[PDB]
Amino acid sequence: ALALYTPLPTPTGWTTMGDVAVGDELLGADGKPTRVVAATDVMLGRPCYEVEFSDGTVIVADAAHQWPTSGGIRTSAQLRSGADRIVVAGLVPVVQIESARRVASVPVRCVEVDNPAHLYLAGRGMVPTHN
């Protein structure tokens, strides 16, 4: 799950995780539209991590949120500053993880998309992440 204030890119603009509705279009890792097919309620009290990327994108996510990295799937809590790179199989890394750290809990929410790779883009830098 991602913080409600996370901006998510869409084919026409930007939404937030808090504002996104089932049936909205997000972006897959291929940069093409992918539909939100399900979403959770707002979840409160979850342990959260702040993840900073090499492009300046910052995303707050819950500890168990999963990311596509050079060494496989990693939860937020297992990302390694200055080592992990966000990569999507077909080679080229999208960004490097600059910092990942525990922060105070904020409201978060999950979405599921219809992308067969289970990926959508998140943050101002449009970083691939797992639903």
Numbering used by the authors: 1 to 90, 105 to 145
Task: Provide passages from the article that reported this PDB entry.
Protein splicing is catalyzed by intervening protein sequences termed inteins. All splicing domains found among inteins have the same structural architecture named HINT (Hedgehog/INTein) which relates to the C-terminal domain of the Hedgehog protein (Hh–C or hog domain). Instead of the N-terminal serine or cysteine missing among class 3 inteins, class 3 inteins contain an additional nucleophilic cysteine residue in block F.
We determined the high-resolution crystal structures of two variants of the class 3 MchDnaB1 intein (MchDnaB1_HN and MchDnaB1_HAA). We found that the most striking feature of the crystal structures of the MchDnaB1 intein is the active site, closely resembling the catalytic triad of serine/cysteine proteases. The WCT motif found in the class 3 intein participates in forming the catalytic triad, in which Cys124, His65, and Thr143 could serve as nucleophilic, basic, and acidic functional groups, respectively. However, the crystal structures of both MchDnaB1 intein variants (HN and HAA at the C-terminus) lacked electron densities for the N-extein sequences. This observation is presumably due to self-cleavage at the N-terminus during sample preparation and/or crystallization (N-cleavage). We observed electron density for both the gauche+ and trans-like conformations of Cys124 in the crystal structure of MchDnaB1_HN, although the side-chain conformation of Cys124 in the trans-like conformation is less evident in the second molecule (chain B) in the asymmetric unit. Upon removal of the N-extein in the simulation, the population largely shifted towards the ideal gauche+ conformation with χ1 = ~300° (−60°), with more frequent rotation between gauche+ and trans-like conformations. This observation might suggest that both crystal structures represent the post-splicing or post-cleavage status as expected from the primary structure of the variants.
